[PDB]
């Protein structure tokens, strides 16, 4: 096609040698426009030749999505692969006419990022490329933020996440399934003791227990289970003559229940403030939490009224 | 009789489609939950509720240069070990044979 | 090493296990490549279960080792080689076959030659039983089933008798065991119908009609299950679900016997005046549940049949996925049940009604307590709960509407979403296990065959109550297995020359070769 | 010991440098170096000419797998030992078989493989032709139901060797090339061999897939051999070869569905079907159903015209097979219309006078059905009648009609409806007549095979009916278990005091679990939700017994509705995915069977009206058939040779041959220069 | 000839129709290979309808012709070329012909769908680029104000409100 | 649907609806553009058919027979 | 008998050994031997130019499947 430069075709055939001689000659491709750019030029090229403009954009975004051009001329190929996959997915959402091609280029960028992380040998190298910001896991936070399914399902990344998640007791996987079951149970019983001892003395070994994120999840699940048990206990202790009397009266169970409710609304406020609002609206679990909290707040407001 | 069984057929094809990309999606969601729980922002349950940058960039550049080298070698290894010979490669081989024969005839 | 470099250690372990599990190394350096393949497949399975990372490589390695063992058996070409392989022991035994069955080598056992040897041993002293008309097969199975007690007493009197040795044939032994179980089921079916007494007796005396004939057979079952618990270990007992159900049934029969003799010795009056927890009523109900557990054992008897054994095996495969989805169903059921209970339990009424709960002529107090709400939401899947359970006898229209909305939402979920998801998931699961159904059925049938191959347990359920030889066996096994290894490596190299594959490397190889020849010619000429 | 030492337990004889260098020289392909090596081996005896590689490659074997003949001639010059190297050359498809035949331990091949068996296994035409020309004979396999003393003696000595020999022999005979060379009649040989191999697959549950693959290969070879026909005269010669369409009837008998559904045979069958007609496929649909109706009404006219004089033009119109199929369909539809008139239009008569308004016309149709089924069951084979399920349905409906008319005659000659006995012969006659009416009007599914759209659907139903029976067995066992258990717990709560309707078929369902028969019925009806929950109530105030009964009933519902009844849907879906790929072929075979059921003159009148030189000719037929078959075999051999080399995939030994060729040319240039 | 040798006649017709349906012969000998591909696909479909035997061969030939037409649409590289092809007539007359002859491969072409989406959203840019709530709001306010645009073009066709009905999206 | 709604007829909803030189120029324009189209098409199928294709037995036979003929020609020359 | 006898019922055409050598040399793509064989076939010899294999592989057809332009030119020349 008449709009194809030699470097664009070189990126299309994806050969590293042709690239490493061609970019020695100081070659730069045209910059494609934004997702919804409608400037004085972009609204005129669509009038001029829509098919030619669309083929030019597809050729440019196939030239940029080649692994050779990412690995040669960028500061961070992982970040370029992430941004290019996100941009290509957004263009495939916008460009209805070429959904398969832009989706395929996004898939190729994701696969390139997955393999480039799969060439990690040492655990030190993996920690370096996962903690890089432009245990902290900023790059993995970006990878989840950019919806990279192949990058995080890799065995090395999942193994590092396992070692971070299990904490001190890395031999928990070495334990049999019965021992894992009774360990989970015996942490699930005395969870308020661990929470209180962290709130008082975090220096000791039981203080550091809650900073294990698997353990943090276990006390969180046991706390929600205790909330559920108190909810059943409300009906088991629903004998405050409320079955007959008109005016609501709050028991000790309802006092604890509203304390849990303000705790969950405080966690909701922390999630909304530290991380944002849009990512809260993305997850269906957070939508369920929001509707639950609105329903409970309306229930208690009507109870007080 | 019609719509519900059409729904059953549609779900059969759909669950045939997701099941191949199933383990990857489950691991991605599990890692999302794990990184949600990795923070030190709120560790309590609901009821209780610069030259260093340059050195880090240099270390990252070294690690990424090594990774780019290894991935280039692995990519060319996989490319040379996976593609199949086509008829055009046969045509180059016929060309080399004919060029041998013509050079032999010209020299002799 | 994990604290220093966890990724390096894990990759090193994976590379070591990938090197040890190669067919060529195993065939060259391992002294016992069959046992080495079995142990390596088992260890790689445990590594796949423990290390959830790198799981695909570990299960591929285990599949490769099973492939190696199957190919090594496929390289046999004589019956004596098969007999000296399967009967070899570390220190008619079929010890290697027992160990391969223990190590869950499915395609090893499902090999045609091993199946041929096991079918030759299964129909011991039979002049072509399989070469028969199906009608003749049916009548001859009927007549060996009918003469079960005479063969039993012939073995008890004269073990050396031809009739006393007739039960030692594993097929006849299986037929007689099935005849004993079918007579047990017929005795229970007569116990349901022959009983025509007052059925009012306070203590329920044990009759001579069916009781004292169920009792021995029950304790023969108990003794047999105790023997299988001792012989083979507790892990082999709990590996099979069928043995677990057999243990549950025997425990229920023992509980029924204990409750009946308790009623004989204590509390020995119209039937309607009995308490709801009377020992005779509990014995009645436990006998009923033990009977529905005992009459389902004929499904385990169906692995021997060729036409439907794979079908029963496939159902046994996807029962686990059924339970996998029933956990999600249980979560939904608990959610909607306790929500509906939290709504309607302020409206509990009695009014002196004849019956309460869902199981009345007119349904009432369905969502009254948590137990009744769980029962009422369970039965709503099958439509046996009418729509008049959602309205209250009072005129609170809003609570009635939101209760009917919650009930309809749960019905929509558990009757459109979850059931059709279960259908689609079952569809994909049976599509996946349709290819592996034949080898699974053959493995299960060989397990059932080799259950009857042993010397012990010959009597049915009524009557249940050296170094030079080792060196010779070792040398015979070594020479046969050396021949097998040589044949396998020759066939593997020949297949390597057979596979339809030509990469771009070999075209470049020919191009470089012809260019080198040309440049040599031009240098010379 | 923190480290696994490795050693060679399977120790070989290894290679000295000189012998290894010689073997590598044969591997490269040098003429002069290998010639010098054998010249040194001849008179100094330093190395052995018959040397063995560690993985098993004597020099003749590398010279075989490199597919060159010069080193073959050179190695056979100094008499290098040859064992199974002829077999290795045969399996490599080398033209060096003549060189290895003309000359004068560890064997990868089994000792029971003679060269012609391996040549037929490789399915190479030139090798089999050369071996048959040289003189060879495949050993004859025994009967598939043979119990001779030699067979059982071989099974006692080595059963695996005997089974492998039988499988190798039947793989040798089933090869298309050996059938093309040796058999006098390739079609009859292919049919008989496919039948024999299917019977062996039924007999041998072990190695079942091998015999099934061999039978599929034989049927496919017959299909392609018919595919190579190029004229109508050749097709009419092939299909009418007796020893009419006699060969087509034989192919139907041997159940060759790929041969029958072949398109040109379908063209011949359509020509025999729509004979002397302006073209039914080239016609408008509404006109087609209009003329279907117009020969539907004119059924008795053509029938009586054939009855009085078949030589009439109207007596010859019926003689066309499509017209007699339309006449039979119209007669059956008239019979069903008579049944509907009997149901709609027809009291207190105890003896029950037979309804002569309708039943005097129905009885000739019943007699015609009995006559037709008797004639089909006796004249036309026995086991093929019981193989067809529609013939079993005809037998059931004819037995029911005979029982109905017998009971009505008995009740008429020797004998208030509400005062009748419950087992009165009139009531049993009515019940049997109703069930037989169900069967008679369900017989119309058999007429959907002639249609071009509903035929594949009907054939797909008829293939999973047997699998449905297989699942119904498991459900029946589960039903028996739960029914027997529920009968145990409730037998003693049998309430029969003044209810006037005991069972599940009253307004108030009572005693649903009070006996085994009623428990079986009530647990059957719980699939469709027609059993209410209050059937688990007793007359007393017991509660734990009620709860155990309710939880057993619920457990049955769960098992039979969520687990088993949804297992059945998935298993049907897999069965239909397996079936629908071959649905067109099976539909065409069944439609051909339906078509040529009307081709012959063994029954031309419809159902209700039918109760009123040789050696020279055989030589000519055999000569014509043999010439046509020679042409067909030549065309098939050329086509199979062409397609074989068209798609091969280029296995790596061809590239190894290329490298060895180029290395041999380089070494010959080095020797010449 | 069918009465003499029906098999040879049917094989002859199948061979001739397989020769005519070849893409190279169509591209080399036909005046209008798009029109030839359309007419040949329709003829092969009706031939498979008439000839119940040999139906798979004729269906394969028709699908091959449709694939050839789709590939010939793939080779275009300009909107001017698309406007020349689709508007050719001897108005999107060739696209009407593709609609009539049931050429789903030809019609569902990404370039043809690009032209169709350009013509459908007549002078309406950024409709897909704008937000879903925004575009549904615009659709709701156009559909709510339906009588004012439909009363126009009935009294004043040349008015801008009268010409608002000219856009096919507004008409839908 | 779109092309049914592209027509000038039926512009009113159901509420309120109750030369030779030009032909030669169009013919020549269509002809020229479709010479371009068929040239691109034959280039494309020639390029496609030259790759993603299996060589199989016939290509190996030709390639080996060329080496055999070359060897016999060299032996004839030398 | 317990052995199946095997024979060619349709024996078809047979070739002389000189004809077989001619066809094999044509398959090898030989210049000199094939040219010499046709030269002796010009005079009265056993070698027939129109030799057809029972596989239907004439030297013409073999050279067509051999694709050697020089060989097919030689065969059409005589
Ligand atoms: C959840 N829900 C419900 O609980 N009730 C019972 C309330 C008391 O009777 C309903 O009647 C009811 C209902 N959803 C309803 O619409 C559906 C939406 C989505 C799915 C669905 O079903 C399926 F998935 F497609 F199968 C049905 N409808 C019907 C309806 C009634 C009034 C109005 Cl204004 C609109 C719709
Ligand atoms: C067999 N069975 C039964 O008989 N009854 C009736 C008892 C008297 O009415 C029940 O109520 C009953 C029951 N299984 C039940 O849980 C299931 C679990 C998993 C699957 C399932 O199957 C399906 F997914 F629904 F298809 C059902 N429940 C509900 C239940 C009731 C009380 C309690 Cl504590 C816990 C659970
Ligand atoms: Ca047991
Ligand atoms: Ca019949
Ligand atoms: Zn712009
Ligand atoms: Zn015999």
Swiss-Prot record, chain A:
Intramembrane stretch boundaries: 176-209
ANK repeat start-end pairs: 2-24
Tissues with expression: Seems to be ubiquitous.
Post-translational modification: Activation of PRKCA induces phosphorylation of TRPC1 and subsequent Ca2+ entry into cells.
Subcellular location: Cell membrane
Residues the entry annotates as binding Zn(2+): 33, 37, 39, 42
Positions on the Cytoplasmic side per record topology: 210-216, 270-285
Subunit comment: Heterotetramer with TRPC4 and/or TRPC5. Forms a heteromeric ion channel with TRPC4, with a 1:3 TRPC1:TRPC4 stoichiometry. Unlike other TRP channel proteins, does not form a homomeric channel. Interacts with TRPC4AP. Interacts with ITPR3. Interacts with MX1 and RNF24. Interacts with FKBP4. Interacts with PLSCR1. Interacts with PKD2L2. Forms a heterotetramer with PKD2 with a 2:2 stoichiometry; has distinct channel properties separate from PKD2 or TRPC1 homomers alone.
UniProt function note: Forms a receptor-activated non-selective calcium permeant cation channel. Forms a heteromeric ion channel with TRPC4 or TRPC5 that has reduced calcium permeability compared to the homomeric TRPC4 or TRPC5 channel. Also permeable to monovalent ions including sodium, lithium and cesium ions.
This protein's name: Short transient receptor potential channel 1
Organismal lineage: Eukaryota, Metazoa, Chordata, Craniata, Vertebrata
Gene: TRPC1
Whole sequence portion shown: 157 to 475 of 793
Curated annotation (Swiss-Prot), chain C:
Domain of life: Eukaryota
Designated name of the protein: Short transient receptor potential channel 4
Extracellular side of membrane: 192-211, 262-281, 341-405
Example GO biological process: oligodendrocyte differentiation
Membrane topology: Multi-pass membrane protein
Transmembrane segments: 171-191, 212-226, 241-261, 282-304, 318-340, 406-426
Isomerase keyword on record: no
Family as reported in the entry's similarity comment: Belongs to the transient receptor (TC 1.A.4) family. STrpC subfamily. TRPC4 sub-subfamily.
Positions with a binding annotation for Ca(2+): 225, 228, 243, 246
Protein's job: Forms a receptor-activated non-selective calcium permeant cation channel. Acts as a cell-cell contact-dependent endothelial calcium entry channel. Forms a homomeric ion channel or a heteromeric ion channel with TRPC1; the heteromeric ion channel has reduced calcium permeability compared to the homomeric channel. Also permeable to monovalent ions including sodium, lithium and cesium ions.
Tissues of expression: Strongly expressed in placenta. Expressed at lower levels in heart, pancreas, kidney and brain. Expressed in endothelial cells. Isoform alpha was found to be the predominant isoform. Isoform beta was not found in pancreas and brain.
Other notes: The interaction with spectrin is important in controlling the translocation of TRPC4 channels to the plasma membrane following EGF stimulation. The cell membrane presentation, the calcium entry function and the interaction with junctional proteins (CTNNB1 and CDH5) are controlled by endothelial cell-cell contacts.
GO molecular function, one term: cadherin binding
The record's account of how the chain is modified after translation: Phosphorylation modulates TRPC channel function by regulating the level of TRPC4 at the cell surface and by increasing the association with NHERF1.
Subunit and partners: Homotetramer. Heterotetramer with TRPC1 and/or TRPC5. Forms a heteromeric ion channel with TRPC1, with a 1:3 TRPC1:TRPC4 stoichiometry. Interacts with TRPC4AP. Isoform alpha but not isoform beta interacts with ITPR1, ITPR2 and ITPR3. Interacts with (via PDZ-binding domain) with NHERF1. Interacts with MX1 and RNF24. Interacts (via CIRB domain) with SESTD1 (via spectrin 1 repeat). Interacts with CDH5 and CTNNB1. Interacts with SPTAN1 (via C-terminal spectrin repeats) and SPTBN5 (via C-terminus). Interacts (via protein 4.1-binding domain) with EPB41L2. Interacts with PLSCR1.
Ways its activity is controlled: May be operated by a phosphatidylinositol second messenger system activated by receptor tyrosine kinases or G-protein coupled receptors. May be activated by intracellular calcium store depletion. Inhibited by xanthine-based inhibitor Pico145.
Gene that this polypeptide is encoded by: TRPC4
Residues of the full protein shown: 184 to 754 of 977
Subcellular location: Cell membrane
Organism: Homo sapiens
GO cellular component: basolateral plasma membrane; calcium channel complex; cation channel complex; caveola; cell surface; cortical cytoskeleton; plasma membrane
Coiled coil: 40-77
Regions of this protein lying in the Cytoplasmic compartment: 168-170, 227-240, 305-317
């Amino acid at each position: 096609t008449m709009d194809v430069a030699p470097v664009i075709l070189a990126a299309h055939r994806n050969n590293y040698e042709i690239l490493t001689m061609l970019l020695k000659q100081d070659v730069s491709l045209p910059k494609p426009h934004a997702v919804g750019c409608e400037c004085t030029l972009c609204s005129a090229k669509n009038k001029k030749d829509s098919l030619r403009h669309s083929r030019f954009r597809l050729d440019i975004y196939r030239c940029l999505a080649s692994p050779a051009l990412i690995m040669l001329t960028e500061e961070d190929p992982i970040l370029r692969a992430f941004e290019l996959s996100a941009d290509l997915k957004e263009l495939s959402l916008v460009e209805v006419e070429f959904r398969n091609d832009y989706e395929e280029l996004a898939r190729q960028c994701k696969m390139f990022a997955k393999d480039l992380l799969a060439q990690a040998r040492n655990s030190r190298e993996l920690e370096v490329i996962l903690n890089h910001t432009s245990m902290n896991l900023s790059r993995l936070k970006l990878a989840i933020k950019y919806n990279q399914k192949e990058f995080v399902s890799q065995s090395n990344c999942q193994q590092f996440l396992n070692t971070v998640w299990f904490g001190q007791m890395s031999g928990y996987r070495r334990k049999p399934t019965c021992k894992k079951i009774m360990t989970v149970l015996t942490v699930g019983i005395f969870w308020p003791v661990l929470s209180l001892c962290y709130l008082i003395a975090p220096k000791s070994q039981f203080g550091r227990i809650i900073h294990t994120p698997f353990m943090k999840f276990i006390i969180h699940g046991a706390s929600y289970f205790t909330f559920l048990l108190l909810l059943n206990l409300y009906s088991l202790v629903y004998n405050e003559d409320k079955k007959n009397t008109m005016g609501p009266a709050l028991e000790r169970i309802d006092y604890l229940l509203i304390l849990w409710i303000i705790g969950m609304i405080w966690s909701d406020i922390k999630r909304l403030w530290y991380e944002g609002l849009e990512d809260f609206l993305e997850e269906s679990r957070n939508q369920l939490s929001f509707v639950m909290n609105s329903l409970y707040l309306a229930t208690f407001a009507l109870k007080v009224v | 009789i019609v719509l519900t069984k059409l729904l059953v057929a549609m779900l059969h094809k759909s669950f045939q489609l997701i099941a191949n990309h199933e383990d990857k999606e489950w691991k991605f969601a599990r890692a999302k939950l794990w990184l949600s729980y990795f923070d030190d922002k709120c560790t309590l349950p609901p009821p209780f509720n610069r030259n260093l940058k340059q050195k880090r960039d240099e270390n990252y550049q070294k690690v990424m240069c090594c990774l780019v080298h290894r991935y280039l070698t692995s990519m060319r290894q996989k490319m040379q070990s996976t593609d199949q010979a086509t008829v055009e490669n046969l045509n180059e081989l016929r060309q080399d044979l004919s060029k041998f024969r013509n050079e032999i005839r010209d020299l002799l | 090493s994990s604290d220093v470099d966890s990724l390096r250690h894990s990759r090193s372990r994976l590379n070591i296990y990938k090197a040890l599990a190669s067919p060529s190394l195993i065939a060259l350096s391992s002294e016992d490549p069959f046992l080495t393949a079995f142990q390596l497949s088992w260890e790689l399975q445990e590594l796949s279960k423990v290390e959830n990372e790198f799981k695909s490589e570990y299960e591929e390695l285990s599949r490769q080792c099973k492939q190696f063992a199957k190919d090594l058996l496929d390289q046999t070409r004589s019956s004596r080689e098969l007999e000296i392989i399967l009967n070899y022991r570390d220190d008619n035994d079929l010890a290697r076959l027992k160990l391969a069955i223990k190590y869950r080598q499915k395609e090893f056992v499902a090999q045609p030659n091993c199946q041929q040897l096991l079918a030759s041993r299964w129909y011991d002293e039979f002049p072509g039983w399989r070469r028969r008309h199906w009608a003749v097969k049916m009548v001859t199975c009927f007549i060996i089933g009918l003469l079960f007690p005479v063969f039993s007493v012939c073995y008890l009197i004269a073990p050396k008798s031809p009739l006393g040795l007739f039960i030692r044939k594993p097929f006849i032994k299986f037929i007689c065991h099935t005849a004993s179980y079918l007579t047990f089921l017929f005795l229970l079916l007569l116990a349901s119908q022959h009983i025509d007494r007052s059925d009012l007796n306070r203590q329920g005396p044990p009759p001579t009609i069916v009781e004292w004939m169920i009792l021995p057979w029950v304790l023969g079952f108990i003794w047999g299950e105790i023997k299988q618990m001792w012989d083979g270990g507790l892990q082999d007992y709990i590996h099979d679900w069928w043995n677990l159900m057999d243990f549950v049934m025997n425990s229920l029969y023992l509980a029924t016997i204990s409750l009946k003799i308790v009623a004989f010795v204590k509390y020995s009056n119209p039937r309607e005046s009995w308490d709801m927890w009377h020992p005779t009523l509990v014995a009645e109900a436990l006998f009923a549940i033990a009977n529905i557990f005992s009459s389902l054992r004929l499904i385990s008897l169906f692995t021997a049949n060729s036409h439907l054994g794979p079908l029963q095996i496939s159902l046994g495969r996807m029962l686990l996925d059924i339970l996998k989805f029933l956990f999600i169903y249980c979560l939904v059921l608990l959610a909607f049940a306790n929500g509906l209970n939290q709504l309607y339990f302020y409206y509990e009424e009695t009014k002196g009604l004849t019956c309460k709960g869902i199981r009345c002529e007119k349904q009432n107090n369905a969502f009254s307590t948590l137990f009744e709400t769980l029962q009422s939401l369970f039965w709503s899947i099958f439509g046996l709960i009418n729509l008049y359970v959602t309205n209250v006898k009072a005129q609170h229209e809003f609570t009635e509407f939101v209760g009917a909305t919650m009930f309809g939402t749960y019905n929509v979920i558990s009757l459109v979403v979850l059931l059709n998801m279960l259908i689609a998931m079952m569809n994909n699961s049976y599509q996946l296990i349709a290819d592996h159904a034949d080898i699974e059925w053959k493995f299960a049938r060989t397990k059932l065959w080799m259950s009857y191959f042993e010397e012990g347990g010959t009597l049915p359920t009524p009557f249940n109550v050296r170094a030079a030889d080792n060196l010779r066996r070792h040398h015979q096994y070594q020479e046969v297995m050396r021949n097998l290894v040589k044949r396998y490596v020759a066939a593997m190299i020949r297949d390597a020359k057979t596979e339809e594959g030509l990469t771009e490397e070999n075209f470049k190889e020919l191009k470089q070769d012809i260019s080198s020849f040309r440049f040599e010619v031009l240098g010379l000429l | 010991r923190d480290r696994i030492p490795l050693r060679i337990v399977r120790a070989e004889s290894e290679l000295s440098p000189s012998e290894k260098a010689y073997l590598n020289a044969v591997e490269k392909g040098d003429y002069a170096s290998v010639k010098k090596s054998l010249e040194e081996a001849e008179i100094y005896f330093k190395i052995n000419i018959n040397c063995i590689d560690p993985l098993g490659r004597t020099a003749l074997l590398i010279a075989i797998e490199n597919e060159n003949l010069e080193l073959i001639e050179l190695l056979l010059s100094f008499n290098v030992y040859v064992g199974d190297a002829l077999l290795h050359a045969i399996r490599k498809e080398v033209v060096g078989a003549v060189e290895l035949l003309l000359n004068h331990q560890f064997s990868e091949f089994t000792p029971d493989i003679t060269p012609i068996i391996l040549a037929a296994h490789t399915n190479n035409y030139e090798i089999i032709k050369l071996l048959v020309q040289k003189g060879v004979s495949v050993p004859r396999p025994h009967e598939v139901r043979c119990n001779c003393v030699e067979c059982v003696s071989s099974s006692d000595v080595d059963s695996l060797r005997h089974s492998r020999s039988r499988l190798n022999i039947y793989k040798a005979l089933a090869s298309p090339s050996l059938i093309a060379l040796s058999s006098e009649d390739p079609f009859l040989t292919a049919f008989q061999l496919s039948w024999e191999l299917q019977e062996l697959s039924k007999v041998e549950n072990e190695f079942k897939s091998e015999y099934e693959e061999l039978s599929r290969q034989c049927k496919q070879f017959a299909k392609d051999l018919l595919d190579q026909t190029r004229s109508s005269r050749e097709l009419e010669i092939i299909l009418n070869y007796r020893d009419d369409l006699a060969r087509l009837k034989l192919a139907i008998k041997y159940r060759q569905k790929e041969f029958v559904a072949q398109p040109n045979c379908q063209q011949l069958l359509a020509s025999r079907w729509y004979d002397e007609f302006p073209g039914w496929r080239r016609r408008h649909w509404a006109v087609k159903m209009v003329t279907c109706f117009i020969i539907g009404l004119l059924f008795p006219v053509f029938s009586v015209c054939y009855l009085i004089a078949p030589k009439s033009p109207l007596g010859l119109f019926i003689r066309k097979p499509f017209i007699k199929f339309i006449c039979h369909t119209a007669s059956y539809l008239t019979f069903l219309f008579l049944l509907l008139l009997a149901s709609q239009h027809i009291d207190l008569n105890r003896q029950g006078p037979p309804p002569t308004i309708v039943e005097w016309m129905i009885l000739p149709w019943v007699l015609g059905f009995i006559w037709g089924e008797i004639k089909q069951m006796w004249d036309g084979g026995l086991q093929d009648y019981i193989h067809d399920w529609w013939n079993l349905m005809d037998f059931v409906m004819n037995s029911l009609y005979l029982a109905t008319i017998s009971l009505k005659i008995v009740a008429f000659v020797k004998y208030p409806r509400e005062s009748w006995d419950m087992w009165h012969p009139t009531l049993v006659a009515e019940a049997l007549f109703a069930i037989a009416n169900i069967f008679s009007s369900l017989r119309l599914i058999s007429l959907f095979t002639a249609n071009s759209h509903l035929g594949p659907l009907q054939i797909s139903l008829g293939r999973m009916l047997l699998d449905i029976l297989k699942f119904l067995f498991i459900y029946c066992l589960v039903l028996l278990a739960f029914a027997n258990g529920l009968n145990q717990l409730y037998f003693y709560y049998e309430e029969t005091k003044g209810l006037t309707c005991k069972g599940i078929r009253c307004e108030k369902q009572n005693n649903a679990f009070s006996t085994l028969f009623e428990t079986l019925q009530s647990l059957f009806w719980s699939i469709f939700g027609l059993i209410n929950l209050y059937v688990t109530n007793v007359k007393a105030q017991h509660e734990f017994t009620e709860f155990v009964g309710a939880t057993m009933f619920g457990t049955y519902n769960v098992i039979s509705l969520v687990v088993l009844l949804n297992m059945l849907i998935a298993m049907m879906n897999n069965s239909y995915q397996l079936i629908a790929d071959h649905a067109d072929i099976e539909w065409k075979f069944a439609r051909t069977k339906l078509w040529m059921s009307y081709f012959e003159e063994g029954g031309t009148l419809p159902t209700p009206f039918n109760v009123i030189r040789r050696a020279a000719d055989n030589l000519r037929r055999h000569h014509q058939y043999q010439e046509v078959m020679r042409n067909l075999v030549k065309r098939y051999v050329a086509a199979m040779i062409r397609d074989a080399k068209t798609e091969e995939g280029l296995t790596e030994e061809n590239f190894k041959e290329l490298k060895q060729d180029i290395s041999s040319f380089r070494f010959e240039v080095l020797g010449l220069l």
